[PDB]
Amino acid sequence: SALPILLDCDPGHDDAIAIVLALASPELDVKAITSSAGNQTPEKTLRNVLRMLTLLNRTDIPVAGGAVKPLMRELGLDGPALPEPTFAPQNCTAVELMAKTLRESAEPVTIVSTGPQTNVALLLNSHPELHSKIARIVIMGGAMGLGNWTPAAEFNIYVDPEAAEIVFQSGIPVVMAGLDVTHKAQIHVEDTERFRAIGNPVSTIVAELLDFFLKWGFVGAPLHDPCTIAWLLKPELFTSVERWVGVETQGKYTQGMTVVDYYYLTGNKPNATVMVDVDRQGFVDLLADRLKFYA
Amino acid sequence: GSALPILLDCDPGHDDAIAIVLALASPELDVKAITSSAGNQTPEKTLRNVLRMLTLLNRTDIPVAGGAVKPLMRELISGLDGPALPEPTFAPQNCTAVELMAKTLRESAEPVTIVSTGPQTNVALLLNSHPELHSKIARIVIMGGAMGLGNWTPAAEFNIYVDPEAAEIVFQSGIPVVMAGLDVTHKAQIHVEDTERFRAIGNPVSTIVAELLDFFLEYHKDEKWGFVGAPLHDPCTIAWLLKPELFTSVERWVGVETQGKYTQGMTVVDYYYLTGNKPNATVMVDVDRQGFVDLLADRLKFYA
Amino acid sequence: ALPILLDCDPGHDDAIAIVLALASPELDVKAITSSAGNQTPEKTLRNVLRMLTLLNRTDIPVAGGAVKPLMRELIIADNVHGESGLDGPALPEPTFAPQNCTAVELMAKTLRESAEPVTIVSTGPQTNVALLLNSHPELHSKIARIVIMGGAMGLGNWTPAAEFNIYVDPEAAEIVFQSGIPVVMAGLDVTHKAQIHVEDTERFRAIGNPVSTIVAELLDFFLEKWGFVGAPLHDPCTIAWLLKPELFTSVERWVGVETQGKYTQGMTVVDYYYLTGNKPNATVMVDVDRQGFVDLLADRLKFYA
Amino acid sequence: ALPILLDCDPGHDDAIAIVLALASPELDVKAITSSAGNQTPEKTLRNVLRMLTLLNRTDIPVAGGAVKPLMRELGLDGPALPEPTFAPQNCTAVELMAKTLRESAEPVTIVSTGPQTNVALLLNSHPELHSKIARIVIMGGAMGLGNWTPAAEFNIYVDPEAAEIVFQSGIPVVMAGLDVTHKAQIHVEDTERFRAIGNPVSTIVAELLDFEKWGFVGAPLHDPCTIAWLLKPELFTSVERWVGVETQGKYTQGMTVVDYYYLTGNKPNATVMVDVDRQGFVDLLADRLKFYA
Ligand SMILES: [Ca+2]
Ligand SMILES: [Ca+2]
Ligand SMILES: [Ca+2]
Ligand SMILES: [Ca+2]
């Protein structure tokens, strides 16, 4: 009855916190966690997935490392003391673990990818016969408005624009947590104190990860990646629009931009659910309430 | 007569038309010439519309010339429907827009302000073909672009989209640029009450302006944008020259995308200073709407 | 014997390349996988199976690959190669099944279990090869080199600037050329010199076995703005180069594939006069001893006696 | 005589093109304007003035043009040349070109042997004068390999946007690219022939041509092919084809894409020179050099 999900990510503090949120939610059955490279080198992102799973006592979840660089371009949890990995990744690549999971699943699986789209694009292009086994792809990346890496582009998308465009043109429903929503999903100093007052080793780690992070004029720090998991858990916390998104791969000034046809100016059929607002307090409540799982 | 000397390049177009009305009712401004760009209409039509507006406004003394027939490297894509306008009673000068612009610069004793409220085609031509006159251009004030969402394609505003290369030439020119994009112009809405205020002013020109606002809103009320009233784009350029204190603006780097698969014509504004790039533009981002409406109605009294 | 992986989109010349490879005991064909380009992926796969049926090598593992280019829609070399993709001669129906997996999977499996580096020969669009490279960076060390048919230093045969295989999937080809693995390129520069004249096709037909018959009837089908004396035979130059590199003249140069141009998508940009900074990444074939090439083919056709 | 406008960036070969044009009474050179590419715009202007001083044609009006490409960033060593004895006109190249067209009674031929910057400016800013332009004869581009980047010839690469403007203009274009110019080589023996003609001008021309991976037998003479094609088109083989200039590629900015095998829908927009009778080209030059006897 739980929703089967594949998590692909590049921890990264917010990826890490998204893993914590997912494993505290019995509505979700995390089938595997695979690592992309962007926030760090692929050796480090893999290591970080293994450390998080060690911390959270879920060494039963299969892990594989993915692509070592973006498709056509060149190419992490400081703060708290984290455990050394006590287990090994699977002897195969992220795409292979993803494909394997799809093949053997009896119902469609949800992909949540919160690093660059590199591994997800590879799976899509290399396994067209498994597209039917993918319910939807939930991403953290992009920005309808101003980017955070270049003027037009958010980092995840900018690191591998081609991979992202492959995802959005794939024919599989996409849900997009871009900067428009994640910038609203701020954790204020008081919130971080709330998480820390919960009083278990994990809520402590989450609070310290957050401590570390601390021209945009944010009141507190945005928490990007957990917005993907939070939307699956409580979509009613979010406002979203169904629109066409294209990713720029050629521009002189705009490589990696997510072009969102908000006012229907193109002929293009919508391919994405674009998150545009969140109930910030509700988002904090969800995170604070699920942290009680590690009591 | 120490008014600010200005060159107006435009593609009327109801809002260009209203910009002309505002400028000629402002003795702070000395309009040296009006030239026509093509965008809102064919170049025959935009030229004609400049001539009709000057005929209406009893300023047949301002020299007019037609400009480029198409964007620098792309194909082109009455223009003042609604009110009855007069037929032209005077002829454009026997030259091109670029030639009239250059002439004006050469013979001006002080730098001239360019206001271009159509595509940037003529301005870019003047810039590239007269580098020895850059010193005679104080600044270029444009209506075009959007820091946020575009009104023509998802990423692009119309004027820039029609001639991205010309706009990039303007912004890379080294001459200070002032940009009235959709971020401010979409705030500069004329509500139905405002159009009634203009109409109550009671002279042939305020009547024309109100009827121009009439036609627009009746036939082009944007149902997806959720505007309370119709945005008045072009007059924001003139208003900023008249009362900059009505506006909020930031000094940022702006690039125009000329190569993107999805983004041709986008004005990329480096709002959060993420690039290395030296600011080249003053980007208007807010306006005091009521004050903007007040300016228009105060200046419409000129035609009493 | 040199272990090779063959990735191809038959297509008459791919087919004749298969024939040549299987008549050469210098080469150990480890698998044949199918790309889409010349035809739909259903048809290319079928035609690999038909050729292996014909040549009684049903022991070679076959798998179908990617159904479309990485980031573009499929276009096919439709009426050039006709209906089935191998029109002309009667061919046998497949008597065996492809492996239960994708081309990239069979490729990876082959590399993993090989004891020495494997040579990839790819004679359709580079789609499967690029997928293997990006998804298996830990197996690059098991790839000796990639030998392609594609590209043109001069004029293209599909658009003014581009050759078909490259044009169908420029992004795949650029991935191959940027990969760090040695590339050998049989482009139109050489393949347009590797013409089979009517006399040569008559020679193949005179060899008198079922297979040389099929190869001759295949060429028959492939027969005026180019002003060729007879028909260029593109794909078998990859295998010929592995068999007898002394037939060929080649230069080591930098090659880039254009993925963004308005007029030039799919161009192979070859830095023939060293004008760029760029480190050579390819061996580009630029000439062939045509008669020697024809001799090679005919000599190896005797294998099917 | 055929009225022509010469826009160029001397440059030794532009210089030799000027020499040939002024020795040809079939041609009426209406004006010479300077582009920037081979050198800075100050230098190219100066060189036009030096050449016309040398050749005793200070009566031909000269103007300096654009100081850089339309959208991008931006010369006669060897022989002793005279200092300029006259001044350029007090206007820009585009102005002098427009003025020339306006006051011509019949269409004018434009020969542009530098980047196409001034010609593109003329075309875009004077659409009412297109009818006064018979054709634009250019030295630039390559159907085959480039001499500047792998895909691109210099003149075109310097201002790809100006070149694409010219080719998309609707005015007939004639293209002397590397395909023909690399065949138009001057061998050591030819340079000695020129030198033996025995006047100050043939001497200057020789001292220029006097001064590796391409494997040329002698030096290609690029710009004079434009003037030669006007004088003796029968020396050349050419094809009527569609030509587009790449202005966006990652690796191919400045490439002239010639649709030699009719693979696009596109209407031909250009006469593309593909061969030359080299000896006949050399004979034309030697023959015309006698003008300065
Ligand atoms: Ca992340
Ligand atoms: Ca306008
Ligand atoms: Ca093939
Ligand atoms: Ca030159």
Q: Give the CATH number of domain B1-304; options: 3.90.245.10, 3.50.50.60, 2.40.50.140, 3.30.1360.120.
A: 3.90.245.10
CATH class (in words) of the domain with range D1-293: alpha beta
Considering only CB atoms, which chain B residues are within 8 Å of A253?
Answer: 255-257, 260, 266, 268
Considering only CB atoms, which chain D residues are within 8 Å of B255?
Answer: none
Q: Shortest CA distance to C3 belongs to which of C181, C186, C143, C148?
A: C143
Query: What token pair was written down for D226?
Result: 């434009």
Residue D131: phi and psi, rounded to 5, are: -65, -15
Alpha helices in chain B (DSSP H): 14-24, 43-56, 97-107, 121-129, 158-162, 164-171, 182-185, 192-200, 204-220, 235-242, 289-300
Determine the residue of chain A that is closest to B276 in CA distance.
A150
DSSP 3-state assignment of C258? Answer: coil
**What is the spatial distance between Cα B262 and Cα B264, in angstroms, rounded to a whole number?**
6
**What is the spatial distance between Cα B70 and Cα B46, in angstroms, rounded to a whole number?**
12
Interface of B with A in 88-147 (CB under 8 A): 147
Dihedral over alpha carbons A274, A276, A282, A284 (to 10 degrees): 90
List chains adjacent to chain D, taking adjacency as at least 3 C-beta pairs closer than 8 Å.
B, C
Q: Please give the method by which this entry was determined.
A: X-ray
Please tell me the number of Cα atoms within 13 Å of B278 on its side-chain side: 8
CB A284, CB A187: distance < 8 Å: yes
Alpha helices in chain C (DSSP H): 12-22, 41-54, 103-113, 127-135, 164-168, 170-177, 188-191, 198-206, 210-221, 236-243, 290-301
Query: What token pair was written down for D126?
Result: 């004077």
Which residues in chain A precede a discontinuity of more than 2.5 Å between C and N? 75, 214
**What is the spatial distance between Cα B33 and Cα B35, in angstroms, rounded to a whole number?**
7
Would you call D15 exposed, middle or buried from its count of C-beta atoms within 10 A (0-12, 13-18, 19+)?
Answer: buried
CA distance to A140, A194, A279, A288, A289, per residue, from A285 (Å): 20, 10, 10, 5, 6
Resolution in Å, one decimal, please: 2.1
CB D138, CB D172: distance < 8 Å: no
Rg (CA), chain C: 18
**What is the spatial distance between Cα B295 and Cα B243, in angstroms, rounded to a whole number?**
8
- Where along chain A do its domains lie? 1-295
**What is the spatial distance between Cα D120 and Cα C101, in angstroms, rounded to a whole number?**
57
Which of the residues of B are catalytic? Answer: 233
The maximal CA–CA distance of chain A, rounded, in angstroms, is 53
If one counts every other C-beta atom within 10 angstroms of the C-beta of residue C292, the result is 14
CB D95, CB D129: distance < 8 Å: no
DSSP 3-state assignment of A49? Answer: helix
Yes or no, beta carbons of B259 and A250 under 8 Å apart: yes
Q: Buried (b) or exposed (e) across D62-101, using 16+ Cβ within 10 A?
A: bbbbbbbbbbbeebbeebebeebeeebeeebbbbbbbbbb
Considering only CB atoms, which chain A residues are within 8 Å of B273?
Answer: 215
**What is the spatial distance between Cα D99 and Cα B81, in angstroms, rounded to a whole number?**
38
Q: Shortest CA distance to C204 belongs to which of C192, C194, C217, C193?
A: C217
If one counts every other C-beta atom within 10 angstroms of the C-beta of residue D27, the result is 20
Q: Shortest CA distance to B139 belongs to which of B292, B15, B282, B9?
A: B282
DSSP 3-state assignment of A116? Answer: coil
Ramachandran sector of residue B81 (left: φ over 0; alpha: ψ -120 to 50; beta: rest): beta
List chains adjacent to chain A, taking adjacency as at least 3 C-beta pairs closer than 8 Å.
B, C
- Of the candidates B68, B168, B259, the beta carbon closest to that of D125 is on B68
Residues around the ion ligand 3 (C-beta < 5 A): C 9, 11, 14, 123-124, 235
Q: Buried (b) or exposed (e) across A243-275, using 16+ Cβ within 10 A?
A: bbbbbbbbbebbbbbbbbbbeebeeeeebbbbb
Interface of B with D in 240-269 (CB under 8 A): 258-259
**What is the spatial distance between Cα C140 and Cα B187, in angstroms, rounded to a whole number?**
57
Q: Which residues pair with D270 in a beta bridge?
A: D173, D241
Dihedral over alpha carbons D122, D127, D129, D134 (to 10 degrees): 80
Does the CB of C175 have a partner CB in chain D at under 8 Å? Answer: no
Residue D153: phi and psi, rounded to 5, are: -85, 150
**What is the spatial distance between Cα C266 and Cα C187, in angstroms, rounded to a whole number?**
13
Transcribe B169-218 into DSSP letters.
HHHTSSS-EEEE-HHHHTTSEE-HHHHHHHHHT-SHHHHHHHHHHHHHHH
Would you call A97 exposed, middle or buried from its count of C-beta atoms within 10 A (0-12, 13-18, 19+)?
Answer: buried
**What is the spatial distance between Cα B44 and Cα C265, in angstroms, rounded to a whole number?**
38
Query: What token pair was written down for D181?
Result: 């110019």
Q: Shortest CA distance to D245 belongs to which of C160, B69, C276, B125?
A: C160
Q: What is the 3-state secondary structure (H, E, C) of B109-129?
A: CCCEEEEECCCCHHHHHHHHH
Dihedral over alpha carbons C238, C242, C244, C246 (to 10 degrees): 90
Which ligand has its closest atom nearest to the C-alpha of B39?
Answer: 2
Considering only CB atoms, which chain D residues are within 8 Å of B132?
Answer: 92
Q: Which residues pair with A278 in a beta bridge?
A: A238
- Residues 6 or more apart from A50 whose CB is under 8 A from it? A63, A85, A87, A89
Would you call C38 exposed, middle or buried from its count of C-beta atoms within 10 A (0-12, 13-18, 19+)?
Answer: buried
- Residues 6 or more apart from C180 whose CB is under 8 A from it? C140, C281
Q: Shortest CA distance to B149 belongs to which of B219, B220, B225, B261?
A: B225
**What is the spatial distance between Cα A182 and Cα A140, in angstroms, rounded to a whole number?**
8
Q: Shortest CA distance to A227 belongs to which of A274, A170, A169?
A: A274
How many residues does this entry show for chain A? 295
**What is the spatial distance between Cα A57 and Cα A51, in angstroms, rounded to a whole number?**
10
CATH superfamily, region A1-295: Ribonucleoside hydrolase-like (3.90.245.10)
Cα angle: D195, vertex D199, D201; to 5 degrees: 80
Transcribe A122-168 into DSSP letters.
HHHHH-GGGGGGEEEEEEE---SS--SSSSS--HHHHH-HHHHHHHH
Residue C234 is among the residues annotated as catalytic for this protein: yes
Residues around the ion ligand 4 (C-beta < 5 A): D 9, 11, 14, 113-114, 223
CA distance to A160, C116, D200, per residue, from C140 (Å): 21, 12, 66
Q: Does domain C1-305 have CATH number 3.90.245.10?
A: yes
